[PDB]
Every structure is written in C-alpha cells, then in structure tokens.
C-alpha cells in the first residue's frame, strides 16, 4: 500500500523533472507496452544517460495528454524494494505484500509498474530455505502478459546479474538508451533552466549553457553527457547564490561556468590570477638562478606551460613532451625537479631503470582482471589520476625495454591511457619530461684523427636507433644539453656552497669563502666531460671533511665561524677555526 | 581548508546530487573537514545557507548489530533516511563510504545500503558526505557507476609546509593540555621539516602531528622536572630518529669516541688500505655531523684491486665496528639480465608478486646498514 | 627489552592513535612484549600511568565462531569495543593483526574489523597492541593505508648473544621445573 508511489500524482504536483526530447526512445517503450506477449520494456544504458528520466517522463507526458490515446491516463507505479522488503522477518510476510500488489495491478489492468534498478529483485526476499524470491513470483504474470512492468538496469548490471536469468530476460525487451548528442543536450538544459533558476534564484545565459556542455565533454571524461552538464549548471547556480556576500548578485556568465568546470576536472583555472601570472613571468629567471646555462631547455618548458595556461595549448596532447639528452652532470634531471617546486605542483618521478624487463608494463598500467595484482592497479595511471596537474619525470628512459616506449605513444598522441580497470588517465596537464643518456660513451670517447670531433650528432643517431620514428615524431622537442662552461662552474660552486651554509645554519655554524678560494675549487674539480657532479666531491673533501672533524670533536661542537682562504705560495686552502 | 570547505558547501546547496565526496590520501584530513564542518557551525563562522544545519556520523557496525532477521536491516536503514528527509536540515556523514556497496546483503541479492539510498540522492532530499582513500575509491567505490554518479568527488591535497605549521599551532592547546607540556615554535617547525625529510611513508599533516604527540608523551614519562612541562627541539629530533630508525641528529657522547677511533680500530683488523678506511670514516663522519648529502647515500664507493687485498674484509668489519647490520648481496647470482626481479620483486600479476624484492625489503627492514655488492662486475 | 617497552608505553600514552605495533621477524619476541607487559604490571615494574591496567588478548577464531547469521559478528565485535571503551584502563592485544583485514567480509563485505576499529583508534578512546611479521606487514597490513596510519610501527631487533643468555637464565626456572633438570651456566652460553 505504501511501497509504490503514483508517479502521475507526483508528476501533477511538479515533482518530476520534464522530459525533453527522447521521442524515439519513448515510442519504442510505448510500442513494447502495447504488445500482446513480452510487452515489458527494459531501458538499458550507461549511468546518467536519462533512463530514469524517461521512465518518469512517461507519467509526466500522460498527465499533459501528449501520449497516444492507446494508453492514455495509465497509472505508472514506482516500486521501492526497500519499503517492500523491510519488516518481512516473519515467514511468508514478503510474499503476502508482494502478491497483494500484483493482485491489485491485475485488477486494474490499465496500470504499469516501474522498478528502478530491477536487477536487485533477484534474491530480494530469499533466505536460507527460502520459499520464493521476487523474481520467480513475477515470472508467471510476465509470461502470461497479465501485467506490464518497466525496468531500468545499467549495462554492467544487465550482464553479470540480469542476463544470467534467461527466463526473466526473455520476457523483457532491451532498449539501448544511447547518450544524446551535444546539440540535443543544450535543448535539454534549456527546458530544465526554470527549475534550477528558481531554486538558486539565478539566471543562466544562452552562451553559458552551450559552453558548459562543450567544456564538460572535452574535460570531464568520467561522467556521461546528461549528467555532467547538469552538474556544471547546478554547481554554477549554488556558487552564484553564495557569491553575493556583499549583495554582488548578477547574471551567471560563461566565466562562472569555466571556474566550476576547472574544479570538477582539477584542470588549471582559466583567466589565471595575477598571483599565478607573476609565477610564470619569472619562472625562467627563477630556474636560471638554480640551474645555470641550458637556456634552451628552460625556455621550451616555460613556453610550453605558458601556452597551455594562455589557452593556446594542444587539443588532446600533454603540455609538453621533451626528451632531455646530453652528457652527465648537467642539469637534465635537476631542471625538472626545480620546475615542479616553482610551479608548486606535485613531481611524479619514475626511475625507468626498473622497467628493463618487457613484462614490467603490468606495473605501470596494472595487471589484467583475474590476476593477483589486479587490486594493486597501475602506478603511473593511478599517480596521474591522483595529481592531474604534475610533472612526469622519466629518468633513464633509454634504460628501459623498447616496449615501455609504446605506452607513451597514446599518452602523447591522444593524451589518454587505459589501465586494467578500464579507467582513463588524463595527461593533458602533465609536463612530460624524459631524461636520457643515449650515446654518452661516444661523447666521452674521442675521435681517432688529427682534429677532434663533436659527438652531439653521434648521440642523436643512437636515439633514432633506440626510439622508433613514431615515438620521435610526437615529442614537442628534443633538447640537447651542452657541456658546462667554466663561467657556469663558478655559479655551480656557489650553489653548492650555499647548500653547505644551510646545513651549517642548522648547527649554529657559519662559513665564509672568498672569491679567490672559490676560483681555486673550480679549477681542481672542473671536468667538461663529467659535468658538475665532480664539484660536489671536491667540496666534500676540501670543505665538508675538515668541518666534520671539527663539528664532532673541536671548536664547532657548540657553534662557531669559519673563514676559508688560500695560500698562494703553497696553493692550498687555509681553514680558520673562529670558535664560539 | 577554506577552499576545500567552500567546495563542500557549494555541493551541499545543489538542487540534486548534493553529496560532497571527500577523496584524498590517508592522513590528509578528510575526516577533519567533515567533523570540522560542525565545529565551525557552532562558532558560527559559516554562511547562513548552512547555518543551523546538523551533521550525523553513521556507524555502519552498530547498524548491522541486530539485523539477522529478514528485512531487519532495511527497516532501520530506511527509518534513518526518513528522519533525514523529514528533518530537511540534517546531514549524514558516512565515513568510509566505500563500505555501503555490500552492506546488509545476506543471500546473493543486490539489495544493499547503496541501492536503498540511490533514489534519495538522485532527488536531493538528503545530503550525504563521504570519505574514501584514493585506492579504496578507485577499486571499490568507482566500480559502482550509479552510486559514483550521485557523489561529487572533491580531491583534497596535503597542505604546504607553511600551512601545516598553522594546523599544529591551532592543535597545540589540545595536545599541550593532555601531556601538560608546552611546545616551542622551533619544535613545531622542526617536526614538520624533519618529518618530511626522513618519514617518507606517511603524509605531512598526520605525520607531523604524530611527532608532536609522541614527544609530549616522552616528556611526561621523564621524571626530571626541568625537561618536563617543556618540549625543546632536541626532543623532537630524538623522536623522529626513533620513528625513522636513523641516527640522532646530535651525536651521542658514546658515538663521538667510536667515530674518532673507527679508523684506528679498522686499521688493526685490516692493515694497509689507509685510503679506503679514510674514505669510509670521513663519509660516515660527514653523515653523522649532519652536513651530508641531501638525498643521496652516505657514500657510494667502488673498491677495485687484486684478490685478497682487503676489499670485502674492510666492509665486513665496518658493520661490526659501528654495530649495524650487514646487507651482503652476492652479485654473481645476478649474472642474467632477468635476475633483476629478485632485487625489486616481480611485476603485478605474476607468481612472485607476493615475495617482493630482496634488496628493497632488506633495506626497509634495516635502513641503517652497510650494503656490500660483492663481485658486481660479474653481474 | 627496556627500550622496546619504553617506546610502547610512550605510544600508549598518546592522545590519538595510541596503538603500538610490534613488527619483527619470526622467532623474535613480539607477543612476549605484549604478553610481558601484563606480567610487569602485576609485579609492579611499570610506570604509574601504565599501572592498574589489564591487557586483553583477542582471539579471532572465538570471535568468528558460530556467526553465520547476518550481524552476529558485528554485534560481538561492537560489544567488545563498547565494554573496552567504558573501561579506559584496558588494552586490547591482537597477536596477528594482519588477520582483521578480511575477518568479517562475506561477499564484497568491506564492513570488517579493519574498517570498524578505524573510528576508535582515530578518536584515541581505546588502546590496541598489535603484532605481525615483516612478510605479512608489508603485503597485508601496509596495503590498508588507513589502518596502517593508526598503528605506530615499533621494530623489534634480534637480541645479542649477551642479551639472549640473560633471557635463558630468566626462563631457566620454569624450564628446569618441567624437565626436572638443572642447566649449568656454561651450558646456556
């Protein structure tokens, strides 16, 4: 008695959303209901397409009188399994009420039943030694065409659960409720505007509705079209309602829609704020104060990021896909780490040397269904979904199997990646940076000739032999890191000295090095073929080693100050341990 | 958490599907924002659209205590939903919302809390707040498209180093009153800074608060009056070293004499090879002094020479002198390319996924240890 | 085992997440630490704060026995936490904490002991002592990031030769009484 709700009464009081369009799907359902046998329409489709809307829109249309007179004034009853199954502890209680409702339905003979998520009726009332389940009770009536029922199940819930029972499946007519077109969704939201407008006390513009459907389709890819557009519109209205803290109430424009879509998709907001605009302005200069030289690399990264924020990005490709090649000890992997720091975005580091085996791909995208590692998922796919705006660093890419380079293809060409669970990872806002050492032996090696030669080109041919043409044709740029110059080394030495001072400050110790001494360190450690790494070893032997012996046992146990100067006659550094 | 909180309010004031889901990693503070939404309401620092609203945290275990009888769970669960719908002001906060996908299912039936609540959420009569980890949401929650479609995912990221310092500052009175201690400003900064560097298996807000609560208990346990009622920076460093199983920042007096005589002791055991002993001792001294590599090992040496000259012996005797574990790894067994799996485990979906990597597991078990890769060239 | 017990007591006095987790190899004494704190309390060799407290050893089999009906496990487990919460001087000791991940899950039954104890540990109302092996901590316990965050890992190290001989001498009376033989000091070494 209180288990079924009359949708006609609910539709007449304005409680059911209006059904816009879907005339083809509506006629198919109505045509099925007018059959003699197997006249039960089953609306099957993805979630958010509008299945429940059509099942409820039928009663809405019947009230308005626009439906064919063959079934005019029919009463659609929406059955909620929760109320029916509740309070049926006693034996035969669930069957008494369920059979009572069916008896009433047959007596009327001009009423249709709607069971949302009808897959749930399988085993609804069953129990240990169960007398009968709801599915079996309805089977006689459905076979004899006595009563007509309307079902609604998703595709996932129509195969594993509903297709199993062939008997019930045969008495239903599957209807593929496909998602509407982009143009059709705009019409749907136009008719629904008054309801949402009255709730939030806001008005939506024509362009705003169109921009929502368009922006949602190209950014939101985890929801269907009639479910995400309404979310953008609904969320925009609530923001507009709460925004007038000082009574600053106005019409909802396209700008408001863009902002809500950004938060839902976690993409950078359009119309970047002045605070963020300043970060990109001096990003190159800020990076140049931590990574000296290699200006071409910093420029490509900064320009790629700017274009994506300014709107002139790629359609369905990452912000940038750069292959940082060059000798060792240069700022290949350092500039990438510093970029994530300045931008304040999460750094996704992936040491590609652990993927030497061709079957390690299962770790990146997860194990297929039916295996032990299916639950774990993929590291790369999950990491991207967690942090859509990040910097994906693939270090030592050339040290991985040639089959790990085929995954990145779709990442660069389509901006997507499908894990084992079928989820799509979005790489449209990730700064893909891959560092390699392809042809490093060649650069170290010298030519057999009177005139030495540049091996930068020799390392390029190796790249071509490792990476296929298709892989190299989708990279925004291939940047070559030139060897560190002498002038650069002086800046690099100061950088390492600054790091030393920070470590000393934590102990209450200070250090001062003159430019005369700093120059001496550069000559001893400078090696064009080994980059800047040797500079950290010279500092360790000349500055950290003497200081360590003093800190543990000496004048710096409880703080102090040091002065480092060189002796010209002996060309050796002098360490002064002032105490404190 | 103004930005994260504001998004939740916007979703709550929606017409339909007004259920703000809070996804994030463990310890980020998902439950803090839900429970905190009520703390703000009592003070009144919230918009008037949500003012006077009530929040009710759901305990799934208590609800399923006495529902053995058929249609016993559905009856009480439906009663709660009726109360929320008729109240028109309360909010249901279902922590660990990924558990309602199989709640109250006895037989092979798909009738559960998720199916029961689904129609109400699609109508916007009730407002529900969820909380789920990233793995749980992606593996259990997101598998139900219908239920996922009724919730508005709100990703929350761990705060910045500066931001988490303010969080601890606000929590200081609660923790200070429990342990009857006072936390210095430097201590809170050191906890955040030191936990980020060493503790790499937890998140910043929770892990930083774990160092502050652990240190407070230690101080109270100590009987000395001067240290009690106060928490210095040195206390925080000891606690972090304990949790991370690493040497303390400040070198102990016992370890200061060991490092001083580490070279002489090794020389007596293994004569000659003064250069090798000096490199190991100097690197260790720098690491304990604190002016070591920011993110690189204490030392990565490559001993090369003839046979029987002391390469393995000096390394084996370094662990004994320092009283640490020795991770002996014979690289001859890794001659083949495919042997790498042993070091880092097999990939997912294979026979050896469960075993794990020998090197990674050994290092995790013994972080402070000497790793000896003998006959690496053979590999 | 003074340092191990000291850290365990420090964790048990925390305002929140006061749940010491004893992780170690197979043979190392982990249950003894949890089951030795009880012996210390009765003898009186424990801080004043940890005095007048009883350690309860939870058995999974007894808790999951005869619970075929829906909600029988939930009732038993909720009653235990209720009685343990109103005590405020009781510590629950689970010998194998890796076994609560799928204790009650029947069919996609995420409602289990692992998901039911989380609100209690986060609120700091109860105290729980755990114990598990490395092989089972990393592959079972560490998978549940939320549950592992409410437990403070306390690594246990194999005792030295000098430490082990003292342990043998402490257990010598009970072992001597069983076999009715007296082990010489040289024999223990």
């Amino acid at each position: 008695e209180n288990f079924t709700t009359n949708l006609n009464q609910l539709a007449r009081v304005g409680g059911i959303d209006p059904l816009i369009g879907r005339e083809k799907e509506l006629e198919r359902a109505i045509q099925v209901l007018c059959r003699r046998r197997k006249n039960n329409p089953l609306l099957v489709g993805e979630s958010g397409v509008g299945k429940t809307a059509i099942a409820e829109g039928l009663a809405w249309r019947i009230v308005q009188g626009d439906v064919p007179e063959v079934m005019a004034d029919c009463t659609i009853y929406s059955l909620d399994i929760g109320s029916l199954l509740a309070g049926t502890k006693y034996r035969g209680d669930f069957e008494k009420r369920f059979k009572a409702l069916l008896k009433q339905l047959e007596q009327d003979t001009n009423s249709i039943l709607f069971i949302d998520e009808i897959h749930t009726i399988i085993g609804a009332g069953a129990a240990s030694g169960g007398q009968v389940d709801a599915a079996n009770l309805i089977k006689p009536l459905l076979s004899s065409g006595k009563i007509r029922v309307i079902g609604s199940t998703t595709y996932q819930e129509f195969s594993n659960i509903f297709e199993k029972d062939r008997a019930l499946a045969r008495r239903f007519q599957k209807i593929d409720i496909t998602e509407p077109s982009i143009e059709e969704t705009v019409q749907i939201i136009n008719g629904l505007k008054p309801k949402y407008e009255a709730h939030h006390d806001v008005r939506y513009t024509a362009k705003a509705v169109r921009a929502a459907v368009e922006l949602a389709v190209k950014y939101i890819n985890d929801r269907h079209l009639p479910d995400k557009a309404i979310d953008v519109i609904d969320e925009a209205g609530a923001r507009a309602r709460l925004m007038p803290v000082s009574k600053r109430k106005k019409t909802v424009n396209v700008a408001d829609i863009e902002s809500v879509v950004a938060r839902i998709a976690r993409i950078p907001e359009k119309s970047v704020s002045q605070s963020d605009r300043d970060t990109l302005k001096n990003l190159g200069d800020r990076l140049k104060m931590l990574v000296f030289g290699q200006d071409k690399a910093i420029e490509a990264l900064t320009e790629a990021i700017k274009m994506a924020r300014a709107g002139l990005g790629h359609e369905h490709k990452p912000v940038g896909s750069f292959l940082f090649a060059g000798p060792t000890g240069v700022g290949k992997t350092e500039v990438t780490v510093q970029l994530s720091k300045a931008l304040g975005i999460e750094l996704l580091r992936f040491d590609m040397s652990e993927y030497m085996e061709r079957h390690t791909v299962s770790r990146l995208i997860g194990a297929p269904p039916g295996y032990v590692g299916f639950d774990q998922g993929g590291l790369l796919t999950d990491a991207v979904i967690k942090h859509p705006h990040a910097v994906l660093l693939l270090d030592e890419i050339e040290k991985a199997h040639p089959d790990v380079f085929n995954i990145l293809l779709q990442v660069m060409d389509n901006g997507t990646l499908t894990d084992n669970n079928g989820r799509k990872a979005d790489f449209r806002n990730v700064v893909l940076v891959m560092t390699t050492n392809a042809g490093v032996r060649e650069t170290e090696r010298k030519s057999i000739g009177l005139i030495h030669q540049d091996n930068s080109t020799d390392a390029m041919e190796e790249i071509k032999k490792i990476f296929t043409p298709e892989f190299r044709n989708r990279l925004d740029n291939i940047i070559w890191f030139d060897h560190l110059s002498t002038d650069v080394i002086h800046q690099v030495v100061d950088k390492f000295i600054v790091e030393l001072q920070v470590q000393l400050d934590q102990k209450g110790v200070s250090l001062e090095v003159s430019q005369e001494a700093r120059n001496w360190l550069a000559e001893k450690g400078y090696d064009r073929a080994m980059g800047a790494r040797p500079m950290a070893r010279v500092i360790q032997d000349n500055l950290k080693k003497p200081l360590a012996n003093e800190l543990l046992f000496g004048s710096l146990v409880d703080g102090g100050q040091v002065t480092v100067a060189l002796d010209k006659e002996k060309n050796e550094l002098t360490y002064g341990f002032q105490s404190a | 958490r103004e930005k994260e909180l504001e998004r939740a309010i916007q979703v709550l004031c929606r017409r339909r599907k007004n259920n703000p889901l809070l996804v994030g990693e463990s310890g980020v503070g998902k439950t803090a924002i839900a429970e905190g939404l009520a703390w703000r309401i009592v003070q009144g620092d919230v918009p008037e659209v949500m003012a006077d609203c009530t929040i009710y945290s759901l305990d799934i275990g208590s609800l399923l205590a006495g529902t053995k009888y058929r249609g016993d769970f559905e009856k009480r669960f439906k009663a709660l939903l009726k109360q929320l719908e008729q109240d028109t002001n309360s909010i249901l906060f279902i922590d660990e919302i990924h558990t309602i996908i199989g709640a109250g299912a006895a037989s092979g039936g798909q009738v559960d809390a998720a199916n029961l609540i689904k129609p109400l959420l699609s109508s916007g009569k009730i407002r529900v707040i969820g909380s789920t980890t990233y793995q749980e949401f992606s593996n259990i929650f997101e598998k139900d498209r219908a239920l996922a479609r009724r919730f508005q995912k709100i990703d929350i990221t761990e705060p910045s180093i500066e931001e988490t310092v303010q969080i601890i500052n606000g929590l200081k009175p609660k923790y200070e009153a429990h342990h009857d201690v006072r936390y210095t400003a430097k201590a809170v900064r050191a906890a955040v800074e030191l936990a980020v560097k060493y503790i790499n298996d937890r998140h910043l807000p929770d892990k930083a608060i774990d160092v502050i609560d652990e240190a407070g208990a230690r101080a109270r346990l100590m009987p000395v009056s001067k240290r009690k009622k106060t928490v210095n920076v040195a206390d925080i460093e000891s606690v972090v070293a304990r949790i991370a199983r690493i040497p303390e920042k400040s070198v102990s007096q016992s370890d200061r004499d060991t490092l001083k005589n580490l070279g002489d002791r090794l020389k007596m055991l293994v004569f000659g090879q003064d250069k090798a002993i000096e490199a190991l001792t100097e690197a260790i001294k720098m690491a304990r002094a604190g002016l070591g590599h920011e993110h690189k090992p204490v030392g990565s040496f490559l001993f090369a020479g003839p046979t029987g000259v002391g390469k393995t012996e000096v390394t084996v005797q370094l662990s004994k002198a320092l009283g640490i574990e020795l991770l002996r790894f014979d690289m001859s067994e890794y001659m083949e390319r495919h042997t790498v799996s042993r070091l880092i485990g097999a990939p997912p979906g294979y026979v050896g996924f469960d075993q794990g990597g020998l090197l990674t597991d050994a290092v995790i078990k013994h972080p402070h240890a000497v790793l000896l890769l003998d006959e690496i060239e053979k590999a | 085992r003074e340092k191990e017990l000291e850290r365990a007591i420090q964790v048990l006095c925390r305002r929140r997440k006061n749940n010491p987790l004893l992780v170690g190899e197979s043979g190392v004494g982990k249950t003894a630490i949890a089951e030795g704190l009880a012996w210390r309390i009765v003898q009186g060799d424990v801080p004043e704060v940890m005095a007048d407290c009883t350690i309860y050893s939870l058995d999974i089999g007894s808790l999951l026995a005869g619970t075929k009906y829906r909600g029988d496990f939930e009732k038993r487990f909720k009653a235990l936490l209720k009685q343990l919460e109103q005590d405020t001087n009781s510590i629950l000791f689970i010998d194998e904490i890796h076994t609560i991940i799928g204790a009650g899950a029947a069919s996609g039954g995420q409602v289990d002991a692992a998901n039911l104890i989380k609100p209690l540990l986060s609120s700091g109302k109860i105290r729980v002592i755990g114990s598990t092996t490395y092989q089972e901590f990393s592959n079972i316990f560490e998978k549940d990031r939320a549950l592992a965050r409410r437990f403070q890992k306390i690594d246990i190290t194999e005792p030295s030769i000098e430490e082990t001989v003292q342990i043998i001498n402490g257990l010598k009376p009970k072992y001597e009484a069983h076999h009715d033989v007296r082990y010489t000091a040289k024999a223990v070494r």
Binding site: R91 | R70, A106, S107, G108 | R70, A105
Partner: peptide, 25 residues
C-alpha cells in the same frame, strides 16, 4: 640464444555467505 618465458599467476574469487533467518511463528 634462448627466450626467457614468464609464468602468469591467476587469482580466484571465493566469497563467504551469511543467512538471514525468518522465525516460523
């Protein structure tokens, strides 16, 4: 030379069941 084969490991799904009883009277 030779090809190093890889053996995948399958996982099976087994789920327990509970019975909600109905009093006879």
């Amino acid at each position: 030379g030779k090809t190093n084969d890889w053996l995948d490991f399958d996982q099976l799904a087994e789920e327990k069941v509970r019975d909600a009883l109905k009093p006879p009277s």
